[PDB]
Amino acid sequence: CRYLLVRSLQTFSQAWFTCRRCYRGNLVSIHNFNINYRIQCSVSALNQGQVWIGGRITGSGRCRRFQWVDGSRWNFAYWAAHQPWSRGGHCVALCTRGGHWRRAHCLRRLPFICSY
Ligand SMILES: [Cl-]
C-alpha cells in the first residue's frame, strides 16, 4: 500500500495523530513481507535505529495483545531475534536494520511511518 516516512522525532502518541492531522492517515499497518521490505529500504538512510508503526501491544496484566491503530487485521509480523515477549513497552517499533520489529516504550521519540 501507500506509505510515507516522517523524520521528525515524536513519541508514538505524537506520531499517530501526526499522520491523521498532517497527512490524513494512520501509522502504517504491515500485512506482508513485501511491504515490510519496501519500508526497510526507505528507513535505511536514517541514522536512527528504529521507527514507529501502527503496532501497539495492549493487554492488562499477562494478557498482552497486538492491535493495529488503523484497525487492520494482524495477519503478519516480522519480530526480531529476542523479541517481543519479556521486554519492551506498549508500542511496536521497526528496527531500521533489516526491518525486524521490536517493542519499545511509546514515550520514545523516534521517526515514524504513515500510510495513506
Ligand atoms: Cl509504555
PDB file of C-alpha atoms and ligand atoms in Angstrom:
ATOM      1  CA  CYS A   1       0.000   0.000   0.000  1.00  0.00           C
ATOM      2  CA  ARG A   2       0.946   3.683   0.027  1.00  0.00           C
ATOM      3  CA  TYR A   3       3.264   4.760   2.839  1.00  0.00           C
ATOM      4  CA  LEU A   4       5.278   7.814   3.862  1.00  0.00           C
ATOM      5  CA  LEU A   5       8.232   8.179   6.221  1.00  0.00           C
ATOM      6  CA  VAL A   6       8.331  11.108   8.651  1.00  0.00           C
ATOM      7  CA  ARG A   7      11.730  12.053  10.046  1.00  0.00           C
ATOM      8  CA  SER A   8      10.648  14.367  12.877  1.00  0.00           C
ATOM      9  CA  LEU A   9      11.160  12.654  16.223  1.00  0.00           C
ATOM     10  CA  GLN A  10       7.839  12.268  18.015  1.00  0.00           C
ATOM     11  CA  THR A  11       6.558   9.931  20.696  1.00  0.00           C
ATOM     12  CA  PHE A  12       4.177   7.241  19.498  1.00  0.00           C
ATOM     13  CA  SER A  13       1.157   9.273  20.607  1.00  0.00           C
ATOM     14  CA  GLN A  14       2.557  12.394  18.943  1.00  0.00           C
ATOM     15  CA  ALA A  15       3.306  10.354  15.824  1.00  0.00           C
ATOM     16  CA  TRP A  16      -0.070   8.644  15.386  1.00  0.00           C
ATOM     17  CA  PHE A  17      -2.148  11.810  15.092  1.00  0.00           C
ATOM     18  CA  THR A  18       0.592  13.495  13.074  1.00  0.00           C
ATOM     19  CA  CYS A  19      -0.460  11.017  10.389  1.00  0.00           C
ATOM     20  CA  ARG A  20      -4.150  11.762  10.913  1.00  0.00           C
ATOM     21  CA  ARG A  21      -3.576  15.508  11.191  1.00  0.00           C
ATOM     22  CA  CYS A  22      -0.652  16.228   8.877  1.00  0.00           C
ATOM     23  CA  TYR A  23      -1.217  13.511   6.255  1.00  0.00           C
ATOM     24  CA  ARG A  24      -4.751  12.143   6.849  1.00  0.00           C
ATOM     25  CA  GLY A  25      -3.919   8.552   7.684  1.00  0.00           C
ATOM     26  CA  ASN A  26      -2.700   6.259  10.427  1.00  0.00           C
ATOM     27  CA  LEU A  27       0.607   4.727  11.375  1.00  0.00           C
ATOM     28  CA  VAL A  28       1.466   2.058   8.835  1.00  0.00           C
ATOM     29  CA  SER A  29      -0.141  -1.381   9.103  1.00  0.00           C
ATOM     30  CA  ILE A  30       2.091  -4.067   7.579  1.00  0.00           C
ATOM     31  CA  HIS A  31       0.403  -7.163   6.148  1.00  0.00           C
ATOM     32  CA  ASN A  32       3.012  -8.963   4.013  1.00  0.00           C
ATOM     33  CA  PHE A  33       6.775  -9.248   3.753  1.00  0.00           C
ATOM     34  CA  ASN A  34       6.997  -7.278   0.501  1.00  0.00           C
ATOM     35  CA  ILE A  35       5.607  -4.074   2.008  1.00  0.00           C
ATOM     36  CA  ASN A  36       7.782  -4.563   5.087  1.00  0.00           C
ATOM     37  CA  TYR A  37      10.755  -4.783   2.722  1.00  0.00           C
ATOM     38  CA  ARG A  38       9.815  -1.583   0.890  1.00  0.00           C
ATOM     39  CA  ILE A  39       9.835   0.186   4.266  1.00  0.00           C
ATOM     40  CA  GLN A  40      13.150  -1.354   5.324  1.00  0.00           C
ATOM     41  CA  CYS A  41      14.840   0.339   2.372  1.00  0.00           C
ATOM     42  CA  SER A  42      13.089   3.664   2.997  1.00  0.00           C
ATOM     43  CA  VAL A  43      14.483   3.860   6.549  1.00  0.00           C
ATOM     44  CA  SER A  44      17.973   2.581   5.719  1.00  0.00           C
ATOM     45  CA  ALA A  45      19.149   6.185   5.264  1.00  0.00           C
ATOM     46  CA  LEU A  46      18.040   7.039   8.816  1.00  0.00           C
ATOM     47  CA  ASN A  47      20.797   7.391  11.387  1.00  0.00           C
ATOM     48  CA  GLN A  48      18.012   6.375  13.782  1.00  0.00           C
ATOM     49  CA  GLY A  49      17.817   2.763  14.888  1.00  0.00           C
ATOM     50  CA  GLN A  50      14.037   2.416  14.996  1.00  0.00           C
ATOM     51  CA  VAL A  51      10.807   3.888  13.640  1.00  0.00           C
ATOM     52  CA  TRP A  52       7.217   3.684  14.838  1.00  0.00           C
ATOM     53  CA  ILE A  53       4.432   1.753  13.122  1.00  0.00           C
ATOM     54  CA  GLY A  54       0.773   1.119  13.875  1.00  0.00           C
ATOM     55  CA  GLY A  55       1.722  -1.750  16.162  1.00  0.00           C
ATOM     56  CA  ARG A  56       0.605  -1.195  19.758  1.00  0.00           C
ATOM     57  CA  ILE A  57       0.780  -4.055  22.255  1.00  0.00           C
ATOM     58  CA  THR A  58      -2.113  -3.685  24.696  1.00  0.00           C
ATOM     59  CA  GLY A  59      -3.288  -6.128  27.396  1.00  0.00           C
ATOM     60  CA  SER A  60      -3.999  -5.637  31.077  1.00  0.00           C
ATOM     61  CA  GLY A  61      -1.820  -7.928  33.174  1.00  0.00           C
ATOM     62  CA  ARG A  62      -0.428 -11.059  31.496  1.00  0.00           C
ATOM     63  CA  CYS A  63      -2.974 -10.516  28.675  1.00  0.00           C
ATOM     64  CA  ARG A  64      -0.685  -8.588  26.318  1.00  0.00           C
ATOM     65  CA  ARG A  65      -2.174  -8.493  22.809  1.00  0.00           C
ATOM     66  CA  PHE A  66      -1.287  -6.857  19.492  1.00  0.00           C
ATOM     67  CA  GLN A  67      -3.501  -4.473  17.517  1.00  0.00           C
ATOM     68  CA  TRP A  68      -3.062  -2.094  14.594  1.00  0.00           C
ATOM     69  CA  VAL A  69      -4.020   1.505  15.289  1.00  0.00           C
ATOM     70  CA  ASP A  70      -5.776   1.795  11.922  1.00  0.00           C
ATOM     71  CA  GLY A  71      -7.875  -1.259  12.802  1.00  0.00           C
ATOM     72  CA  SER A  72      -6.468  -3.640  10.198  1.00  0.00           C
ATOM     73  CA  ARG A  73      -6.169  -7.359  10.818  1.00  0.00           C
ATOM     74  CA  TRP A  74      -2.979  -8.706  12.393  1.00  0.00           C
ATOM     75  CA  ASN A  75      -2.079 -11.216   9.687  1.00  0.00           C
ATOM     76  CA  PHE A  76       1.714 -10.790   9.619  1.00  0.00           C
ATOM     77  CA  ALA A  77       4.664  -9.917  11.843  1.00  0.00           C
ATOM     78  CA  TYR A  78       8.460  -9.836  11.448  1.00  0.00           C
ATOM     79  CA  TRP A  79       9.706  -9.902  15.041  1.00  0.00           C
ATOM     80  CA  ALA A  80      13.424  -9.668  15.756  1.00  0.00           C
ATOM     81  CA  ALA A  81      15.609 -12.227  17.484  1.00  0.00           C
ATOM     82  CA  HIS A  82      14.974 -11.921  21.234  1.00  0.00           C
ATOM     83  CA  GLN A  83      11.647 -10.175  20.572  1.00  0.00           C
ATOM     84  CA  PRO A  84       8.959  -9.444  21.550  1.00  0.00           C
ATOM     85  CA  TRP A  85       7.983 -11.015  24.859  1.00  0.00           C
ATOM     86  CA  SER A  86       9.631 -10.350  28.229  1.00  0.00           C
ATOM     87  CA  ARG A  87      10.807  -6.869  27.201  1.00  0.00           C
ATOM     88  CA  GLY A  88       9.722  -3.543  25.776  1.00  0.00           C
ATOM     89  CA  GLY A  89       6.850  -1.144  26.348  1.00  0.00           C
ATOM     90  CA  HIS A  90       3.378  -0.849  24.844  1.00  0.00           C
ATOM     91  CA  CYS A  91       4.327   0.215  21.306  1.00  0.00           C
ATOM     92  CA  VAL A  92       5.902  -1.704  18.416  1.00  0.00           C
ATOM     93  CA  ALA A  93       8.961  -0.312  16.620  1.00  0.00           C
ATOM     94  CA  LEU A  94      10.556  -1.357  13.330  1.00  0.00           C
ATOM     95  CA  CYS A  95      14.329  -1.748  13.552  1.00  0.00           C
ATOM     96  CA  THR A  96      15.952   0.259  10.762  1.00  0.00           C
ATOM     97  CA  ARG A  97      18.483  -2.583  10.357  1.00  0.00           C
ATOM     98  CA  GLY A  98      16.968  -5.482   8.431  1.00  0.00           C
ATOM     99  CA  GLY A  99      13.375  -4.437   9.088  1.00  0.00           C
ATOM    100  CA  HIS A 100      12.750  -6.515  12.219  1.00  0.00           C
ATOM    101  CA  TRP A 101      10.002  -5.323  14.552  1.00  0.00           C
ATOM    102  CA  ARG A 102      10.938  -4.540  18.148  1.00  0.00           C
ATOM    103  CA  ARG A 103       8.902  -3.493  21.168  1.00  0.00           C
ATOM    104  CA  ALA A 104       9.612  -0.022  22.530  1.00  0.00           C
ATOM    105  CA  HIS A 105       8.260   2.364  25.135  1.00  0.00           C
ATOM    106  CA  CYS A 106       5.724   4.649  23.478  1.00  0.00           C
ATOM    107  CA  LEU A 107       7.233   7.775  25.033  1.00  0.00           C
ATOM    108  CA  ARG A 108      10.372   7.175  22.952  1.00  0.00           C
ATOM    109  CA  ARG A 109      10.726   9.893  20.314  1.00  0.00           C
ATOM    110  CA  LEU A 110      11.547   8.191  17.004  1.00  0.00           C
ATOM    111  CA  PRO A 111      10.676   8.796  13.357  1.00  0.00           C
ATOM    112  CA  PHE A 112       7.578   7.022  12.115  1.00  0.00           C
ATOM    113  CA  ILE A 113       5.825   5.708   9.015  1.00  0.00           C
ATOM    114  CA  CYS A 114       2.399   6.980   7.957  1.00  0.00           C
ATOM    115  CA  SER A 115       0.122   5.207   5.480  1.00  0.00           C
ATOM    116  CA  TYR A 116      -2.493   6.840   3.272  1.00  0.00           C
TER     117      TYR A 116
HETATM  118 CL    CL B   1       4.577   2.087  27.504  1.00  0.00          CL
END
